[PDB]
Amino acid sequence: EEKEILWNEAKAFIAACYQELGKAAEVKDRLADIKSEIDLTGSYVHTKEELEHGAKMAWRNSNRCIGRLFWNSLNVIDRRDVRTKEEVRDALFHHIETATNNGKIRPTITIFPPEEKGEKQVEIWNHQLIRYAGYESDGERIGDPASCSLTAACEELGWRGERTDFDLLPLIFRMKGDEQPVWYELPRSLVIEVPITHPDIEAFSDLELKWYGVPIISDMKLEVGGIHYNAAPFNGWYMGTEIGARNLADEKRYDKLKKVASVIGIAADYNTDLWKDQALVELNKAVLHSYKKQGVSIVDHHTAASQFKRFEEQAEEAGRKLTGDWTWLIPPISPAATHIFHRSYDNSIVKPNYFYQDKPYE
Amino acid sequence: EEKEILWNEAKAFIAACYQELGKAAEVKDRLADIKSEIDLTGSYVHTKEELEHGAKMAWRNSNRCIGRLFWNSLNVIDRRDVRTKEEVRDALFHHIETATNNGKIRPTITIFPPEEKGEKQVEIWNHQLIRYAGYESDGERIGDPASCSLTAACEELGWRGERTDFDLLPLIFRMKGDEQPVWYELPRSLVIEVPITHPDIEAFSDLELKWYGVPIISDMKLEVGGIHYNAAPFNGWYMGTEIGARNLADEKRYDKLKKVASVIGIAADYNTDLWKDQALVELNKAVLHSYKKQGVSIVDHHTAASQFKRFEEQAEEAGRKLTGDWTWLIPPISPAATHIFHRSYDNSIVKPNYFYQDKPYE
Ligand code: HEM
Ligand code: HEM
Ligand SMILES: CNCc1cc(OCc2ccc3ccc(N)nc3c2)ccc1Cl
Ligand SMILES: CNCc1cc(OCc2ccc3ccc(N)nc3c2)ccc1Cl
Ligand SMILES: C[C@H](O)[C@H](O)[C@H]1CNc2nc(N)[nH]c(=O)c2N1
Ligand SMILES: C[C@H](O)[C@H](O)[C@H]1CNc2nc(N)[nH]c(=O)c2N1
Numbered sequence: 001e002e003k004e005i006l007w008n009e010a011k012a013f014i015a016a017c018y019q020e021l022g023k024a025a026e027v028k029d030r031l032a033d034i035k036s037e038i039d040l041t042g043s044y045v046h047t048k049e050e051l052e053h054g055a056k057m058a059w060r061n062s063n064r065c066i067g068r069l070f071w072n073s074l075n076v077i078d079r080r081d082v083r084t085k086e087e088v089r090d091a092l093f094h095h096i097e098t099a100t101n102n103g104k105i106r107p108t109i110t111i112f113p114p115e116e117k118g119e120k121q122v123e124i125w126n127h128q129l130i131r132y133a134g135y136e137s138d139g140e141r142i143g144d145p146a147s148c149s150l151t152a153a154c155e156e157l158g159w160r161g162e163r164t165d166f167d168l169l170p171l172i173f174r175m176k177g178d179e180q181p182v183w184y185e186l187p188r189s190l191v192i193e194v195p196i197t198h199p200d201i202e203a204f205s206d207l208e209l210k211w212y213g214v215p216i217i218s219d220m221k222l223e224v225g226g227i228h229y230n231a232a233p234f235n236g237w238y239m240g241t242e243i244g245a246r247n248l249a250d251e252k253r254y255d256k257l258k259k260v261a262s263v264i265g266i267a268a269d270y271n272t273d274l275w276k277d278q279a280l281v282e283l284n285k286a287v288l289h290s291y292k293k294q295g296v297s298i299v300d301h302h303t304a305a306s307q308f309k310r311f312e313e314q315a316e317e318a319g320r321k322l323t324g325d326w327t328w329l330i331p332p333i334s335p336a337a338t339h340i341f342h343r344s345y346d347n348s349i350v351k352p353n354y355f356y357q358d359k360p361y362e
Numbered sequence: 363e364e365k366e367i368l369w370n371e372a373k374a375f376i377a378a379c380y381q382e383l384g385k386a387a388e389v390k391d392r393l394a395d396i397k398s399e400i401d402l403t404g405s406y407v408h409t410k411e412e413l414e415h416g417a418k419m420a421w422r423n424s425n426r427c428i429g430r431l432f433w434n435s436l437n438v439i440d441r442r443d444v445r446t447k448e449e450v451r452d453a454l455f456h457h458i459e460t461a462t463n464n465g466k467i468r469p470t471i472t473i474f475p476p477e478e479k480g481e482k483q484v485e486i487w488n489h490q491l492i493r494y495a496g497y498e499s500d501g502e503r504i505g506d507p508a509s510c511s512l513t514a515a516c517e518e519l520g521w522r523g524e525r526t527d528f529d530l531l532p533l534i535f536r537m538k539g540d541e542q543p544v545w546y547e548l549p550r551s552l553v554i555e556v557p558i559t560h561p562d563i564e565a566f567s568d569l570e571l572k573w574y575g576v577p578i579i580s581d582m583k584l585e586v587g588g589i590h591y592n593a594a595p596f597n598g599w600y601m602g603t604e605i606g607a608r609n610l611a612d613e614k615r616y617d618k619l620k621k622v623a624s625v626i627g628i629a630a631d632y633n634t635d636l637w638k639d640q641a642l643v644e645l646n647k648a649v650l651h652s653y654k655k656q657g658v659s660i661v662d663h664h665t666a667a668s669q670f671k672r673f674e675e676q677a678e679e680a681g682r683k684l685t686g687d688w689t690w691l692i693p694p695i696s697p698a699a700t701h702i703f704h705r706s707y708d709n710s711i712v713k714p715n716y717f718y719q720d721k722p723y724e
């Protein structure tokens with residue numbers, strides 16, 4: 001009864017995928033083989049081109065991504081051949097290295113073996129391959145609260161953080177057959193970090209803020225043609241607002257606005273002074289400036305919105321139905337200064353796509 | 363077949379209204395009379411208390427209003443007795459005067475006779491009782507583009523604007539029986555305007571920006587117990603963002619950001635400098651400051667969001683189902699610094715409420 005679910009989403013996928021590549025004729029005799037393969041193996045295997053394109057189509061259908069203009073330039077690394085922890089670790093190490101590309105960030109996705117009978121071959125515990133640890137115990141609040149439960153879960157595994165505000169979490173994943181995950185501390189040479197400075201406010205460095213260069217999501221499930229690549233970490237570059245308006249700004253994250261208001265020489269006393277709004281802007285100016293000063297790829301929300309408009313234009317031209325999540329597409333900084341705010345989008349889910357999956361810890 | 367629509371929404375309304383006022387016993391013999399009145403007259407008439415409460419319940423169920431905490435302090439003026447243009451005009455004049463209250467703005471609603479057989483007794487053409495005119499002709503762009511079509515419609519009626527950027531539109535409404543609307547120029551003594559200045563940037567006055575004190579929506583339909591008060595202008599006070607982030611900021615409105623960026627001494631050349639975001643904040647600081655300096659009521663988006671949180675709290679306490687429109691509840695300035703951003707709301711429409719109705723012009 002599963003071989004009809006997998007088959008009907010494989011009919012849809014192959015037909016559409018080969019249609020876009022100009023291989024519509026090759027559809028019929030590829031579908032046939034799949035029907036055979038599914039029947040006799042319970043599943044089927046993608047070609048280099050199907051997987052590569054299917055992962056680009058998945059990015060294209062992400063309603064919450066504002067950076068989908070470059071969906072076709074996605075660098076797809078095929079690691080469906082890995083069988084050991086050392087291969088997975090080194091694949092993850094390589095991904096970090098190639099995606100970072102000395103700072104000229106390259107949108108990349110490493111794809112590991114998909115679920116067989118729903119069973120995960122690999123099971124990545126990291127939300128991102130590079131993320132800061134978080135600790136809270138006895139009134140103490142160190143690091144990133146978002147990473148509190150994974151951190152505690154790592155410290156149940158022999159790992160121990162230095163309890164600075166920017167402890168790199170180790171890579172932690174579990175292989176099929178094993179009861180517990182392994183962890184590997186990250187080589188620092190593989191991780192670029194950016195110290196946040198202001199272009200004209202020298203006191204800003206006293207905050208000692210920094211962030212990591214490359215955002216590599218590693219807990220989402222790639223679904224391509226009925227096949228579940230539960231482990232397929234991908235990355236883009238940062239939009240400045242993700243760091244300056246959320247990660248470093250949220251009260252339930254790094255909560256830096258009052259400190260920012262202090263170093264920029266304004267009071268944080270009255271709402272009518274709009275001190276949070278002013279601190280948000282100066283902090284966000286500092287983030288973009290700090291990245292471009294170091295030579296790490298980053299985009300501002302305005303430039304990103306322009307690009308997304310081109311994506312909309314490009315979509316209508318190709319007769320492609322556009323889908324988007326308005327609530328996630330609008331930037332948390334001056335959303336009304338972008339075209340996104342003033343129009344609506346269809347939040348319909350089209351496959352291939354990236355999905356949430358249940359965490360293994362907590 | 364209409365007397366069953368009107369009756370079933372009157373059953374719902376009276377039952378709920380009297381329940382909240384503590385007059386649940388009086389429900390039965392009031393409903394009876396209504397069934398009689400509807401049968402023999404085709405409609406029914408609200409008491410002072412039903413109309414007053416029903417208009418407060420309508421405000422409470424406005425999913426897009428962030429200022430609903432004060433739903434119960436709404437000043438309800440009952441003008442269902444008006445029959446002439448002079449009465450309507452003077453009622454509208456009085457509303458402006460009492461709502462303004464020398465600057466200590468009083469949330470007020472004036473309620474005119476409702477539709478009889480769907481026929482409007484009065485038909486208000488103004489979007490707001492106080493709004494600036496807009497002109498565009500031969501590359502010229504004067505005033506508020508939002509008011510372009512009403513302005514052109516007024517100039518078809520013998521009215522003529524001075525073509526400044528802040529021409530007060532006249533009151534314009536049509537009475538039952540007449541083919542054309544009448545217009546009345548507003549007494550300036552009834553209209554408070556606020557000149558926008560900056561607390562610490564003296565050059566800001568060179569922009570010669572100003573706005574009107576009281577926002578009085580007059581083109582929405584109040585629906586209370588199956589009865590359609592198509593003409594019931596209401597007002598609150600301004601949230602600063604409405605003036606600084608939309609009215610004066612939007613490209614399709616006053617489009618002031620580059621001029622703002624100029625007077626505050628920054629470049630409007632690069633997106634990565636976040637010049638729009640910085641101009642938005644300084645412009646919004648100027649608006650709140652300018653209103654409080656003059657003594658006209660205004661609220662900032664932070665204080666407003668706090669109040670709306672109390673409204674949520676007060677709603678759960680009273681066992682009231684909360685409804686909201688997330689897309690409209692979030693402020694266009696730093697929405698992620700408010701609790702509203704980080705939670706969801708049910709956009710369900712509960713009556714009594716305020717609705718859009720089709721414009722008579724254009
Ligand atoms: C190239 C630069 C990219 C930028 C600037 C960008 C920007 C964004 C941003 C700002 C978000 C919202 C994140 C949040 O609010 O927490 C987002 C969501 C998302 N992006 Fe992208 N993105 C990029 C590339 C990619 C790539 C390469 C993929 C995968 C192939 C991708 C897939 C997604 C997905 C799945 C989400 C939704 C995450 C969720 O549901 O929580 N994006 N993107
Ligand atoms: C007391 C101060 C008030 C504040 C600060 C306030 C704030 C707001 C704001 C900011 C909006 C969004 C407007 C927009 O984005 O264009 C809104 C929408 C709305 N408010 Fe209020 N409001 C107040 C009082 C009232 C009153 C007295 C009523 C009527 C009884 C009301 C009914 C509404 C309605 C119906 C909408 C939706 C308008 C639409 O659908 O376009 N509000 N409110
Ligand atoms: C609160 N965030 C929840 C969440 C976000 C996730 O990803 C956000 C995300 C995903 C892809 C991105 C790609 C590029 C980029 N700059 N940011 C990106 C941000 C994934 C899982 C969860 Cl549970
Ligand atoms: C783009 N706006 C459309 C529109 C807005 C309308 O009202 C917005 C509105 C309504 C009530 C308000 C009450 C108080 C306040 N400060 N702003 C308020 C703003 C009414 C009709 C239309 Cl068609
Ligand atoms: C399509 C989208 O809902 C539309 O642009 C909305 C967005 N949110 C808004 N929010 C407010 N307060 N006012 C508006 O006019 C809008 N416009
Ligand atoms: C409930 C609401 O949808 C939720 O708070 C959303 C709002 N919009 C968002 N937008 C982005 N980009 N990221 C988020 O995490 C959220 N959270």
Ligand SMILES: [Cl-]
Binds near residue numbers: 215242247
């Ligand atoms: Cl992040």
Ligand SMILES: [Cl-]
Binds near residue numbers: 577604609
């Ligand atoms: Cl307005």
